Design a protein around this nucleic acid. Sequence first.
RNA 1: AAGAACCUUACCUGGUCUUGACAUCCACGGAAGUUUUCAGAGAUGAGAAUGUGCCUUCGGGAACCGUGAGACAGGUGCUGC
RNA 2: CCGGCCGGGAACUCAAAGGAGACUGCCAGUGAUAAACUGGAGGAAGGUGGGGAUGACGUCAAGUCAUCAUGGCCCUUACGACCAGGGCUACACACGUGCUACAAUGGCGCAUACAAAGAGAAGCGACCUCGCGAGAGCAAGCGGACCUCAUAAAGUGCGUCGUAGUCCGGAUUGGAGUCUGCAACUCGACUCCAUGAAGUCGGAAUCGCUAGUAAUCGUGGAUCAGAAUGCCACGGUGAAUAC
Lengths: 206, 98, 151, 86, 114, 100, 127
Amino acid sequence: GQKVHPNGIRLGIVKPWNSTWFANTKEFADNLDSDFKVRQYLTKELAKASVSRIVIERPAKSIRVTIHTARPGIVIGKKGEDVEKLRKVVADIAGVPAQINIAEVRKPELDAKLVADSITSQLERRVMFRRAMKRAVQNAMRLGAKGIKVEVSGRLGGAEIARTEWYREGRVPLHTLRADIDYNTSEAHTTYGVIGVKVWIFKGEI
Amino acid sequence: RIRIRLKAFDHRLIDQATAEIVETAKRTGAQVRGPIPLPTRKERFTVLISPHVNKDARDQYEIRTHLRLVDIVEPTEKTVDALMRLDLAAGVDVQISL
Amino acid sequence: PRRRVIGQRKILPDPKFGSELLAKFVNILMVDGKKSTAESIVYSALETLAQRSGKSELEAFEVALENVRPTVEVKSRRVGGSTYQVPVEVRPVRRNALAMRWIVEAARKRGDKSMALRLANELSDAAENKGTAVKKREDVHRMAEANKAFA
Amino acid sequence: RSLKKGPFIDLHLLKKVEKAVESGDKKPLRTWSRRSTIFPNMIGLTIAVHNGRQHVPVFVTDEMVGHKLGEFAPTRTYRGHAADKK
Amino acid sequence: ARIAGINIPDHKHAVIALTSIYGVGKTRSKAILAAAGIAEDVKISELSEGQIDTLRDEVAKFVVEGDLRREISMSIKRLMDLGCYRGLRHRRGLPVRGQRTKTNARTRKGPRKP
Amino acid sequence: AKQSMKAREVKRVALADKYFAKRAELKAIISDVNASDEDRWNAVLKLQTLPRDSSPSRQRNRCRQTGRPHGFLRKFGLSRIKVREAAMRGEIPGLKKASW
Amino acid sequence: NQYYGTGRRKSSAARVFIKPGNGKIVINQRSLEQYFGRETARMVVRQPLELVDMVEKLDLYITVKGGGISGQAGAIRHGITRALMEYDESLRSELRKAGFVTRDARQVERKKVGLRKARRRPQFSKR
RNA sequence: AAGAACCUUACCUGGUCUUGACAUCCACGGAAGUUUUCAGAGAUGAGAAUGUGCCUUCGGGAACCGUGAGACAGGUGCUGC
RNA sequence: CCGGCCGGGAACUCAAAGGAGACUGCCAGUGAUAAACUGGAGGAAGGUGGGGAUGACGUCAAGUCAUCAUGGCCCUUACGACCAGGGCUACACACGUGCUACAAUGGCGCAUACAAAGAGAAGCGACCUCGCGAGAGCAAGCGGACCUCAUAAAGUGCGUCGUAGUCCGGAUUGGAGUCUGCAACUCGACUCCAUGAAGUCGGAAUCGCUAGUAAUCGUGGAUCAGAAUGCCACGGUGAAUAC
């Protein structure tokens, strides 16, 4: 569990940063604050909308937020009525204005955060993790994902002792930096306590 | 007459922008010196890895910052207009000077 | 190490003449990386020596080294659980090296005034081979001889 | 040894000691300020300095002026120890 | 040459010779030599007797041995009389400046009791 | 995470910018040697008249998230752990692990 | 025609010009002796040339920057080895037979975390 | 603990408040804000001058600030087996 | 105006990007004609070229509810909140870990050179002027390949100190000051004057380290109002041993 986080070592490699913007040493601090703020706001408000990830950019002292989501219609709302409000609210903490660019994930079951949020939505319903894991692995293999390693840890269906469990399938070369491997860690609240869900997804050799 | 010194993080991300600005320059009258690669600043960092104790175990980091000089000699109107509001390049901070 | 029989490092020969042996003496003398000072004390000593011996520096040291040169030495091996020393013949490559270590050993021992004076005194005692180095040699022979019965 | 220009006293203590002098010595003062500096006029006063648990009365003498209030109210108390002589 | 308590150095150089007096050290003695014009390397015995005669009132310009002794002792006696925390540490024999008494400052603390 | 301490900190932030960096010269210049011997007394007396806070030196410069005083980084403002968690999530550009 | 070599010993960079005719050596406007040739390891820079003729046959104008004394001296050495290129294999036979052609980079290692100078432990205690 | 002079602080003594230092809910009032004085160790407490801005529904508002209600807030309080 | 100072050149370093290069590829021999190894060659480099990052299955029901988050439990006119002062630095001791030592391969005096890598706009702050000094006054320039921190020191040469608790060492203490910060007593650092402690290379026991390594030298940072012998990083000089 102390093993290296796969995304961090490939940030200079095959994993471009979710927020790509330069700033001077003075305002960089505040811009990180605002970044964390908008990421929280968009996280909470769009939580039920199953956003996969939010790609911040800040050209010319103005923010442009790309948004990869599983269900673009539920995010946008009826004919964009939400989008504008999302631009106003965000712009207020963004330093003004707030451009936004929607984007749909063609294969949402592949993407890690969508999978984890699904598994959490199953766990809150008291669904059995032993089924959830095999279901995720089933969808991953049906899409032909080159590799996968699902892992979870916690109370496990009310057991008094916390326990780790996992189920890998396919080739999983974590040591190979050439590898195209998505990854996520998402906590799942339950009546007995938090249950961490880690999800490795090996998409391709390059 | 003009001395531009642009900067960005990733080299591969700044290169195509350098190509676009040099090309924008060549088409607008050119009179270009030829961009200078410049030394790259590399801020070293070493943060404690653990939430508590484990003083022996630390994690290294760095933030490379590539810079490039441009140096256009002509004070041409076509040049100063092309250098204005065609810079684009998100994530790449340009600094014009005369 | 368990396996590698890798050989010695290639030290630089002495600038005036190709006596890499004494260059290894300059190595076994240098402290705190003060190479030039250690070398300067070496040349100053060889000059103070050769004029008194009448011989050239290198050969004057040759007939001092040869006299202080170790014969055999005891070392722990093949313990019966009660532990006892085993005398054995030295490797010739270890011979002059261990000798120069005994020279520097005798040099660091005793005090007079200047370290150049102690060095000159040890070399002078080595000229007519009655010094602390031959003393340590004959002492190692005393540590043996009575132990020489063992084999 | 500190404060090149201007000996330091907190204004509430210089006013309490001012109107304490002009009114004649009566009772000790309740000051908490260890931070101030003795001044010539403060002499003869029994002003109690805070040692952190309570106030200890100290009788100011002109022989002590350049010093400060604190060090005459020792805070930490180590009594002696236990000697445990054998 | 005979002044102070005793002050009879020999073989010593002028500054180190003067250092023997309580209350005077290196840089002050060098100031005495810069005042008299005397060279640092001169021996105390070879140096001119009349230059020593000037040396006497010259170093008399600065208070030294016993007067400094009784001055410092009178100061420490003063601190003890004040009842100041500093003077209390002088009474205990423990350090005054702020050195840790928990482990080190053994020198001022004296030899270890057990 | 000790919200009252963070609100106390930011209250020192606001109030501290509100007083000093404006009236601050009253000590930063006037208390420095100049031809105003009589005034400097009334100056420092107004200096103590100011509240004990407002001074930047009393700012421990707490983290903007947990509020933890220690492990802080002025270059970011985040505590070491949170800037590392943001780093591993790819929030900070060019903050890759270094090996040279 | 003037000949040239470069070389770079331990972060220092040397630059070595050499010409036929005159025999004197000059480094950074300073005399061969006053700069390093009166300090120890003076003869090392000439050590490859001891194998051949030097005296009047060739002269050197050297510039160097970076590093310490021995670093700039070895930089002069590598710079002479690189400046023998016009006589290429003809000198590289015996010269490589004596080495000196080798880069001998051996750069200092970076301090490792928790280790004082990239090896030393903080005096580990058994308990 | 990548830096305890105060601050930090979780600690001790003493002085302090109980919808509370901070967040959300509502009523009922004031723009907020401003400079200045006194009592007090200080926080607080009592003043004094000063200001009354931001769209329209201009009967309203909204922002900020103050008093009141309880729901709640808060906890470096315990439990890393 | 002997300073690349400026005309002048991109020549060469330097500076980066982007490529080539070392792969047991070639020679010989060995090896079960196997893989593979040994030796050699050329080659800048020869065997994983040097270094760095990357921590399998899992274990230790390891440490962390005091980073944060969290299931419950507990207090909620106090197990909450604000302020002053104090303390976290207390000392009959014991242990762990770093630094300066115990000296003339040295200390001290003058002269004399030679680095790298970082940091700087609520800031880095030249120069000049004042002060033995720490620092003060003014203040150009610098968002930095320009300017500032910012003079590297060990070293090199000569001069002296002539082997003693000594011109070693610098502890401790007394006095006189500087700067920071509301605030330097508790409880800063630095400077100057004075003072010169133990200690004569350290026992039983015990540690690290195989090359640009150990040893030794100095420089810079982050933390920070101020305050490193700690931490992290940089280069200079530069070994011995491997039977």
